[PDB]
Amino acid sequence: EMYIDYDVSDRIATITLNRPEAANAQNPELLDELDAAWTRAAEDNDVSVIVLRANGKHFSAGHDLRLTLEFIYAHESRRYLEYSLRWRNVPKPSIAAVQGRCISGGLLLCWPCDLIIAAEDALFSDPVVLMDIGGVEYHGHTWELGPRKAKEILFTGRAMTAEEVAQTGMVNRVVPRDRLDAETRALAGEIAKMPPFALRQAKRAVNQTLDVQGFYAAIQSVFDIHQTGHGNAMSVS
């Protein structure tokens, strides 16, 4: 349990990213620990609500950078795409608490949560166009931001403030940094009073509407677009 802390109390499972020395950059080991924590929470009948949070100044700087396309495709399809979709589908409510920087692969950790609470000084970005890739592997951008904002931030690599993403509906609530854990836990507690099958089916109502709208199919389509970026990058260098 190096990289990920796990606590259960009052029917809330709190999963903490604990690699602040690297701004919670994600290596394969961290991702495997994180996927195990989600599974543990999903399987525990004493857990009603999942809280995903991070220690330190920044939620996550993204994937830790430190050969065939088939190899990249296979690895990214598991740890990036399959993991994030599995988290998305866990049949209990989940809430991310985001402070400071949430960059590129960071979005693959919070987007799968049902609700997001952000500190006022949180900054969200996906500057991977600079590295020759058309946005990260799990394309929540268009769904979360709308297409024009998604294009703007992909084309420029600029950051968005917490208030800006709250306006698009990607962030549910913006609170001062000193209230982020308070607000997240209070909301988790309110939700934890509710019947678990009703929570499950409320979640399913919304997620199935998104899937009818094309969410699953679109996420799969964009994964292949992303991979053409890797294929081009390899062909150049």
* Count of residues near its own copies by CB under 8 A: 84
Q: How far is the CB of 76 from its own copies (least distance, A)?
A: 11
Amino acid identity, residue 215?
F
CB nearer its own copies, residue 30 or residue 171? 171
Amino acid identity, residue 1?
E
- Contact between 230 and its own copies by CB under 8 A: the answer reads yes
Cα-Cα-Cα-Cα torsion 130, 23, 7, 10, nearest 10 degrees, comes to -70
Q: How far is the CB of 80 from Zn ion (least distance, A)?
A: 7
Contact pattern from residue 99 through residue 128 relative to its own copies, giving x for each residue in contact according to CB under 8 A and a dash for the rest: ---------------xxx-----------x
- Contact between 67 and its own copies by CB under 8 A: the answer reads yes
Kindly identify the residues of this chain, within the stretch 137-156, that bind Zn ion according to CB under 5 A.
137
Contact pattern from residue 38 through residue 77 relative to Zn ion, giving x for each residue in contact according to CB under 5 A and a dash for the rest: --------------------------------------x-
- Contact between 54 and its own copies by CB under 8 A: the answer reads no
- Locus of tokens 């929570």: 199
CB nearer its own copies, residue 21 or residue 43? 43
Give the residue, chosen from 146, 159, 164, 181, that forms a contact with its own copies under the rule CB under 8 A: 146
- Contact between 39 and its own copies by CB under 8 A: the answer reads no
Q: How far is the CB of 91 from Zn ion (least distance, A)?
A: 16
d(CA 225, CA 227): 5
Phi then psi for residue 98, to 5 deg, are -115, 115
DSSP characters for the chain?
A: --SEEEEEETTEEEEEE--GGGTT-B-HHHHHHHHHHHHHHHH-TT--EEEEEE-SS-SB--B-----HHHHHHHHIIIIIIHHHHHHH-SS-EEEEE-SEEEGGGHHHHTTSSEEEEETT-EEE--GGGGT-SS-SS--HHHHH-HHHHHHHHHH---EEHHHHHHHTSSSEEE-GGGHHHHHHHHHHHHHTS-HHHHHHHHHHHHHHHHHHTHHHHHHHHHHHHHHHHHHHHHH-
Contact pattern from residue 75 through residue 94 relative to its own copies, giving x for each residue in contact according to CB under 8 A and a dash for the rest: --x-------------x-x-
Kindly identify the residues of this chain, within the stretch 191-210, that bind its own copies according to CB under 8 A.
191, 194-210
Residue 176 interface partner, choices Zn ion, its own copies, none, CB cut-off 5-8 Å depending on type: none
Give the residue, chosen from 2, 66, 130, 178, that forms a contact with its own copies under the rule CB under 8 A: 130
Residue 208 interface partner, choices Zn ion, its own copies, none, CB cut-off 5-8 Å depending on type: its own copies
Token pair, residue 137, equals 């592997």
Provide the binding-site residues for Zn ion, judged by CB under 5 A.
Answer: 76, 137
